[PDB]
Subunit: 388 residues, 4 copies
Amino acid sequence: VEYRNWSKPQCQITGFAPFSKDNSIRLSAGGDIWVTREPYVSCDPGKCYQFALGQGTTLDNKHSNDTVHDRIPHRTLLMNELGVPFHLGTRQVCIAWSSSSCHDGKAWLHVCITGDDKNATASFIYDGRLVDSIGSWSQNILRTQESECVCINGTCTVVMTDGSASGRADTRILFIEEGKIVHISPLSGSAQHIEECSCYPRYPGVRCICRDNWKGSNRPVVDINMEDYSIDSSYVCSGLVGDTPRNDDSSSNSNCRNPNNERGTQGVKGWAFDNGNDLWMGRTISKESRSGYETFKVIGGWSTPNSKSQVNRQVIVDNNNWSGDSGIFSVEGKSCINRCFYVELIRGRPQETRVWWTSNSIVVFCGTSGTYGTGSWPDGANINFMPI
Amino acid sequence: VEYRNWSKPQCQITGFAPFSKDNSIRLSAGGDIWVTREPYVSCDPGKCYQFALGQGTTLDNKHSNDTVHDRIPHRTLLMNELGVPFHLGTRQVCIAWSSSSCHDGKAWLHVCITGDDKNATASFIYDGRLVDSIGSWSQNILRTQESECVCINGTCTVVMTDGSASGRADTRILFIEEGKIVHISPLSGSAQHIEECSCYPRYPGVRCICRDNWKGSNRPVVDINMEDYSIDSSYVCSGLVGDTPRNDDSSSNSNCRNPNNERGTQGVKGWAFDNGNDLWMGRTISKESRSGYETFKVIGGWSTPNSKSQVNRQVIVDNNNWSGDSGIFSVEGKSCINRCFYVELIRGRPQETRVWWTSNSIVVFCGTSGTYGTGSWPDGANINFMPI
Amino acid sequence: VEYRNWSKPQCQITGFAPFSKDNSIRLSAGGDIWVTREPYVSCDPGKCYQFALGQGTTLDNKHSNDTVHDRIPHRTLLMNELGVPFHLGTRQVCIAWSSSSCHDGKAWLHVCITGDDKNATASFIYDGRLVDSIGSWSQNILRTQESECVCINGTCTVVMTDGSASGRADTRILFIEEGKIVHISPLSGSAQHIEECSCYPRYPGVRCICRDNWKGSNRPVVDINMEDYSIDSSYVCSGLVGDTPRNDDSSSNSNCRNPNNERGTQGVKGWAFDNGNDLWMGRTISKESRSGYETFKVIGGWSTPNSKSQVNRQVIVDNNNWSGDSGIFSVEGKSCINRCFYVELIRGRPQETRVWWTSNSIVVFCGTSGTYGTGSWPDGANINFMPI
Amino acid sequence: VEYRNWSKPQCQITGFAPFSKDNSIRLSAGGDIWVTREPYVSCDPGKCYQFALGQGTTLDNKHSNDTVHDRIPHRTLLMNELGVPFHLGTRQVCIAWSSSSCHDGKAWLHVCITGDDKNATASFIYDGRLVDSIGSWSQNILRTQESECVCINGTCTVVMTDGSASGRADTRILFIEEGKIVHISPLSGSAQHIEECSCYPRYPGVRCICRDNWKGSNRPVVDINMEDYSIDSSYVCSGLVGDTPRNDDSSSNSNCRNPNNERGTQGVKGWAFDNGNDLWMGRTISKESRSGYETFKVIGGWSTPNSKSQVNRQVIVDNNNWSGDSGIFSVEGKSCINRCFYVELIRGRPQETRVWWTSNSIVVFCGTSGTYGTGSWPDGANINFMPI
Ligand SMILES: *[C@@H]1O[C@H](CO)[C@@H](O[C@@H]2O[C@H](CO)[C@@H](O[C@@H]3O[C@H](CO[C@H]4O[C@H](CO[C@H]5O[C@H](CO)[C@@H](O)[C@H](O)[C@@H]5O)[C@@H](O)[C@H](O[C@H]5O[C@H](CO)[C@@H](O)[C@H](O)[C@@H]5O)[C@@H]4O)[C@@H](O)[C@H](O[C@H]4O[C@H](CO)[C@@H](O)[C@H](O)[C@@H]4O)[C@@H]3O)[C@H](O)[C@H]2NC(C)=O)[C@H](O)[C@H]1NC(C)=O
Ligand SMILES: *[C@@H]1O[C@H](CO)[C@@H](O[C@@H]2O[C@H](CO)[C@@H](O[C@@H]3O[C@H](CO[C@H]4O[C@H](CO)[C@@H](O)[C@H](O[C@H]5O[C@H](CO)[C@@H](O)[C@H](O)[C@@H]5O)[C@@H]4O)[C@@H](O)[C@H](O[C@H]4O[C@H](CO)[C@@H](O)[C@H](O)[C@@H]4O)[C@@H]3O)[C@H](O)[C@H]2NC(C)=O)[C@H](O)[C@H]1NC(C)=O
Ligand SMILES: *[C@@H]1O[C@H](CO)[C@@H](O[C@@H]2O[C@H](CO)[C@@H](O[C@@H]3O[C@H](CO)[C@@H](O)[C@H](O[C@H]4O[C@H](CO)[C@@H](O)[C@H](O)[C@@H]4O)[C@@H]3O)[C@H](O)[C@H]2NC(C)=O)[C@H](O)[C@H]1NC(C)=O
Ligand SMILES: *[C@@H]1O[C@H](CO)[C@@H](O[C@@H]2O[C@H](CO)[C@@H](O[C@@H]3O[C@H](CO)[C@@H](O)[C@H](O[C@H]4O[C@H](CO)[C@@H](O)[C@H](O)[C@@H]4O)[C@@H]3O)[C@H](O)[C@H]2NC(C)=O)[C@H](O)[C@H]1NC(C)=O
Ligand SMILES: *[C@@H]1O[C@H](CO)[C@@H](O[C@@H]2O[C@H](CO)[C@@H](O[C@@H]3O[C@H](CO)[C@@H](O)[C@H](O[C@H]4O[C@H](CO)[C@@H](O)[C@H](O)[C@@H]4O)[C@@H]3O)[C@H](O)[C@H]2NC(C)=O)[C@H](O)[C@H]1NC(C)=O
Ligand SMILES: CC(=O)N[C@H]1[C@H]([C@H](O)[C@H](O)CO)O[C@@](O[C@@H]2[C@@H](O)[C@H](O)O[C@H](CO)[C@@H]2O)(C(=O)O)C[C@@H]1O
Ligand SMILES: CC(=O)N[C@H]1[C@H]([C@H](O)[C@H](O)CO)O[C@@](O[C@@H]2[C@@H](O)[C@H](O)O[C@H](CO)[C@@H]2O)(C(=O)O)C[C@@H]1O
Ligand SMILES: CC(=O)N[C@H]1[C@H]([C@H](O)[C@H](O)CO)O[C@@](O[C@@H]2[C@@H](O)[C@H](O)O[C@H](CO)[C@@H]2O)(C(=O)O)C[C@@H]1O
Ligand SMILES: CC(=O)N[C@H]1[C@H]([C@H](O)[C@H](O)CO)O[C@](O)(C(=O)O)C[C@@H]1O
Ligand SMILES: CC(=O)N[C@H]1[C@H]([C@H](O)[C@H](O)CO)O[C@](O)(C(=O)O)C[C@@H]1O
Ligand SMILES: CC(=O)N[C@H]1[C@H]([C@H](O)[C@H](O)CO)O[C@](O)(C(=O)O)C[C@@H]1O
Ligand SMILES: *[C@@H]1O[C@H](CO)[C@@H](O)[C@H](O)[C@H]1NC(C)=O
Ligand SMILES: [Ca+2]
Ligand SMILES: [Ca+2]
Ligand SMILES: [Ca+2]
């Protein structure tokens, strides 16, 4: 039982291969399955787990009505082995309407936020016990990543933001050792309006690609120095931008430094990672709505502003199907650290009004150095077959 | 593995942070979930478990009718990891309409009482086998804590009562080693009625805050010497009293020694713990019924008779929602012993007569030395969605 | 991991204390629960398991119709931790309409009989793999204990019968090492019909109390020598006889040697055990049907022919409620080997014709050297509340 | 833990004894159970697991409609302990409409194929992580064994085919070390079409008996050299042929070398294994459809062309009941390697059109050196009791 250091090079991938799918909504029409949203994946050194925020109810249940609402006291963090759908034997790890989890090589850390919008509490649970907590600092919806945190040599880091809703984002980067907060660093650099960071180890530090909670369709970047707690930040250079809504590729812009003002309505959590000068990224296929999902490599997408040449595109979910939040997780291999991602497949409200609930399933892909084909792996439920 | 000694100082807490919630009743409307009451939480050295007394039936089941009653032969002690709701794969640990459980560092002890009101049997199960038993000594509902027992150096102590619910009874403190009763001591001291003790390690001894069902709305205290088996008892000093029913805050009293004779008949299981001269305690918000739940610190609440200065109040369940029993459990951290509590959230009878059943969910909080905000975490089920 | 030898004295027993109850039938009215019969209990060195023969269906299921029949190809041996009811996640350990199981200290042996009445197959599965098998030797319902087998120093023994249910049959005692049949001994001694033996370790040998289905309401005894494989047999001395049907106590007899010819046809699986000259035993309360269940000690019940002085009676199931098969299991304590028993609580056909199925729950008690009270712990389902 | 080498002789067998049955379809009428097909069994060194390809739905679920189709994006590989039916807590190990799995002594390998018919992807998951992938090489339904792969000394081998189902195709044998493809060998030898290989260790190599879907109703054999990666192939010598369809026993033939051109188009997955010059094999009882299942030894069936002398026949499923795929798995005993097999019991479409779904249960038998009787162990569901 040694601490993870993630001190291997990043795997040099050619694209992604199918890893997992849970079929939650299809099963929900013939079984008792939790209503969820904001899922993610994180792995201990041996095996992977799927997480999501429950809505305190199963789908075929009158309490499923109005589950489009983001925050209620009954939301809890669910945790199963990856591919075990959220059945009634699922453990609720903590009370949470916003969360992040990660394993440090020895045990699990869970960051769980619940309570009043104006005065939330974040609990820090490590190795099965509550070790620390912090209250809201801006009194305006304290929130965190909705994907895995990252630990190096026993110190885990997680990004949180309070006050972005009111246009006064106060973003802080926490450093946590065995559940205890040992340092808090304010955001520094040129990133603004940070929400929902998707972070990954990039030894010796941690790098996050997030979303801008005002009008940037280009994604913020946060760099975390684990040695001295210093922070820097910017925007992804790629002219093929990662958020939705967004302009078409021809009329999209990013200068690597500032938000581009090219998204007019609420954006979506997503991810990307650098490989030298290039950038691997995912995004919705639609530029208007959370439908479809595609991945590709942008040539110069990390280093060159407004870079727009891509290669190695893959469709994950075709544009006739709903997507949602997406995020990165990292998995240690023999010789390298691999990058994987999940896609939230949102069903029900607001897009599908036959039913009165909102829930999701997931699909999960992992980096590969090998070869692969094509397909599309959507949620797959028939909305007309569902309990309403 | 080694026996627990709990020989660390008590954590110096600033209040409590959210830890767990099971949503049992909301789930029961769309899933097969046990009917329960008298829940509690207890942890082995690695992880926490939720316990409750089943009623031998699920909620959506005609057998859930009449479950307001406390004692039937079909009640069994249920045990799951904390946050796993009581689904059909839940283990029934023993036959019990009253119970207590605890882990000594090596194995679980369960104390399970069942049978005739006039002639009950308590079974003592340790490390998976029945080791001892004792029969009723007063022929009037032999009964115990309904929360965790406490073990130091391999000796587990539990408080049991037999006799009148509305007059002098026969309370005994048992000392149990690897499931075998090794000593039994009579209650001594000035407490006049003892039920449903909430006990905690206070090395080298154990301290319990209980329910007086006869003449006191102040809570009795039992002090257990684990070295020589001597017993003392008194009442919590705080003029802000912990039982329900009770007088309002302006007219309630305690003198630390005698029951206050203030709405003293009846009561509810609850808890408190000392910190120096001060007292941390929970209670229902209502002074009349099991409605709402709040915690606070009483300055001088341990040492000073009739102290009423409070600080650090937190609402756990607002007064528009039902509560129920509550109890303490203790969790060993790196440097100190933390105190946590659960609240039973009773739904159905007698308060909600639209349905014919009585069941509960739970919410659980743990001490923190950090900061926190506010909220309310009630059961959350809509009584009108439930099967009757 | 060492082999069990059971080489400690039998525990002092003053009677029995409640240990477990599964509430299977009550749960079946609001949940997906297996239809079963022929249950039993057996423990590995750390924990106990409940076993039963499934009927290849849940109760609330059209396939539950006409499950009164004892042998169909869909019967499988179910195995859960004791107290975990037979939910849909239950493992089916082998195909079986008759079975026995036991743990040798290192791994589980299962003896599983299935197939045609006139040509059945017994499979021997050990440590998760099929190691041996034997075919029917008398072409008339090869069948075994329906309770735990017994292992000493890595050799497990089990009693099996083939041939007439109402006349002379061919009973053999098998000796099995790591799943392999290493010896077979014919039944010898004065027992004239042996079925459904309830066996226990009495180091260095094994002792069984069985069912005579032909000529006796007194129970046969089989003694097994594990050193030279020799077998002896006789009848329990007690004039308070253990089978059902039987004469009333005033006209019932046993001479320790021959079947009593007192309502000697038919019968039910049961148990007893010796303690010096005395006998601890269970039986149904009714002398006509499988109704009620009582235990008591017969003074001289082991050594003295026709002894009828009983003491220490306990009602387990009152005579207004259905019972069924019962059997013994043994549990190793720190200093002695304890004796426990289970009772099958049969519900449905043929006694209860409102429903079309037959199933059971269980209740389980363990020997105690302590004290205890009284009660009754029947199945508890309301036949009117059940799916038919 | 050490790598498996399977370096023990094959167990003596006299026939097969009952091992497991899951009753999936019977249970589906009163419980939430996955719709599946293409099941198989594989064991780690300690215990066995059942696998199958889910259809992304339970049976009693409108999404079960039209699950006769073999490939949709929602198919995932399910894995439970053997005998645990596919309930809602079952883990979906990967996305797959064709699969193979095996344990190398240290960890599990899963080969999972999904995506577009003309451009599928195979993922290779080992020890809980994606290690490699390969894309379709013939752009026509990349597909694999639907039963266990085989590993010797840390190298696992699996047979895969891409191309026509009704003409020459492109079959390759992969060699995989800790999830990484280290070599790929083209099919060589006289086998003209290879699908759905049932492979087993035959130290120092691996031997496979497969399905020729083009010109043969005799089963092809593939021999795999694990040391130098060389491949040979032929046909099973037995004149009693193993595919369906096939000619009757009087007019069927095999010459060991070439497809027999006897009702050679179409087929079903099955198995056989050698013992010296003799052959043990299973097949459907019907020569036309997947009805019934029988096993027998063919004297000289491995070495003598057109041998038809069968002996030691056993009915596994009588010819009034549906069967389906069947396959081999191998289990290491104390001194020898045993051979076992499973039979898929297909219910629903296309044979049973009362219902709109297609699913299966399983029955499993293992080699025995002992004796046995007779029986028939079909699926057992009443099609008239099923949800449609
Ligand atoms: C209770 O259960 C048991 C176990 O399940 C069951 O016993 C099995 O019964 C089946 C059905 O009868 C047996 O399977 C059949 O075997 C038939 C062949 O067996 C005879 O021929 C064998 C081969 O002979 C050829 O080869 C030899 C050289 O090897 C050569 O000399 C011969 O001339 C010939 O060329 C031979 O090996 C075998 O020998 C055994 O028995 C003889 C006595 O006769 C003995 O001397 C030997 O020592 C040895 O023990 C034997 O002579 C085979 O024809 C038959 O297949 C046909 O019928 C089935 C239908 O049944 C058709 O489907 C099929 O298409 C064929 O037309 C089948 O394979 C099986 O062997 C038994 N198992 C065992 C272990 O004994 C009982 O019957 C059950 N009891 C009841 C009443 O239910
Ligand atoms: C966000 O979340 C936090 C944490 O939950 C909330 O802060 C908590 O608020 C409650 C309610 O106000 C506090 O509990 C109360 O404490 C007072 C006692 O303190 C007051 O009176 C003291 C003299 O008796 C005085 O010294 C105090 O002022 C000093 O200290 C405070 C810090 O404690 C500091 O902020 C000041 O600057 C001073 O230095 C203070 O004025 C107690 O009287 C209350 O009990 C009465 O009221 C309750 C109802 O509120 C009633 O039910 C009782 O019967 C009784 O009549 C009560 O215990 C608690 O201490 C705060 N916690 C912390 C850690 O500060 C915060 O309010 C939330 N904000 C929002 C907007 O949601
Ligand atoms: C079988 O599967 C393989 C593997 O998935 C697949 O090969 C891939 O094809 C895609 C599409 O041609 C390639 O990705 C493209 O790369 C070019 C650069 O060479 C880019 O210009 C492309 O982007 C443009 O076109 C996209 C639509 O295709 C637009 O969405 C985008 O906005 C741009 O306009 C795109 O990135 C990919 O590199 C290969 N992968 C590999 C490893 O070769 C193959 O096509 C499939 N076979 C068949 C018959 O379809
Ligand atoms: C949940 O269980 C409760 C408790 O059983 C049940 O409520 C009860 O319903 C029964 C009727 O089924 C009521 O029975 C009556 O009790 C009164 C006394 O209060 C008697 O006087 C009645 O007897 C008269 O009516 C009979 C009708 O046949 C006549 O035969 C008889 O001669 C008398 O005229 C009768 O027995 C009982 O009062 C209630 N109890 C309560 C608490 O309401 C309830 O129905 C169950 N719920 C569900 C959904 O099934
Ligand atoms: C509280 O619980 C205790 C313990 O269970 C219980 O004491 C037990 O009472 C029974 C019944 O009196 C005792 O068993 C009897 O022992 C006498 C010999 O002393 C026998 O003669 C009895 O057998 C006859 O009577 C039976 C009916 O009781 C008949 O069924 C039988 O055929 C015989 O005619 C019987 O064995 C038992 O010894 C005590 N146990 C102990 C440890 O003292 C007590 O009665 C309970 N009290 C209440 C109020 O419920
Ligand atoms: C969950 C809930 O309804 N809580 C109420 C509570 C209960 O209704 C009551 O205790 C049950 O017997 O009632 C409380 O408030 C008082 C009421 O008893 C009264 O009817 O109305 C009063 C004011 O007009 C007063 O509010 C209480 O016990 O505190 C209030 C609580 O919300
Ligand atoms: C659970 C139950 O109903 N038990 C009854 C029992 C059964 O009804 C009966 O044995 C089933 O056939 O009946 C008993 O009561 C009486 C017998 O003692 C008597 O020998 O026969 C009577 C009828 O002729 C009568 O039924 C019993 O077996 O003890 C009593 C019991 O409560
Ligand atoms: C499970 C079952 O019904 N098995 C039948 C089987 C099937 O009905 C049939 O193969 C499906 O197409 O039919 C079999 O017997 C006969 C055929 O051999 C014959 O060619 O045609 C008959 C009239 O239709 C009948 O089908 C068979 O394949 O062996 C018999 C079997 O019990
Ligand atoms: C063994 C037993 O019946 N315990 C019950 C006790 C006693 O009735 C009470 O303490 C008086 O003795 O009351 C409860 O706590 C209660 O009030 O809700 C329920 C609990 O089941
Ligand atoms: C293999 C088998 O069928 N065993 C059955 C036996 C035998 O019928 C009986 O011992 C006569 O031989 O009866 C039972 O125990 C019984 O009476 O309830 C049920 C059991 O299933
Ligand atoms: C990947 C795939 O589709 N495999 C399917 C194969 C192929 O159709 C067949 O081998 C011809 O290539 O047939 C089955 O085995 C079958 O006949 O029941 C079902 C299976 O799902
Ligand atoms: C059970 O089966 C019997 C015999 O076929 C039949 O008469 C009865 O109606 C069935 N019961 C139910 C509830 O379907
Ligand atoms: Ca009181
Ligand atoms: Ca008899
Ligand atoms: Ca063919």
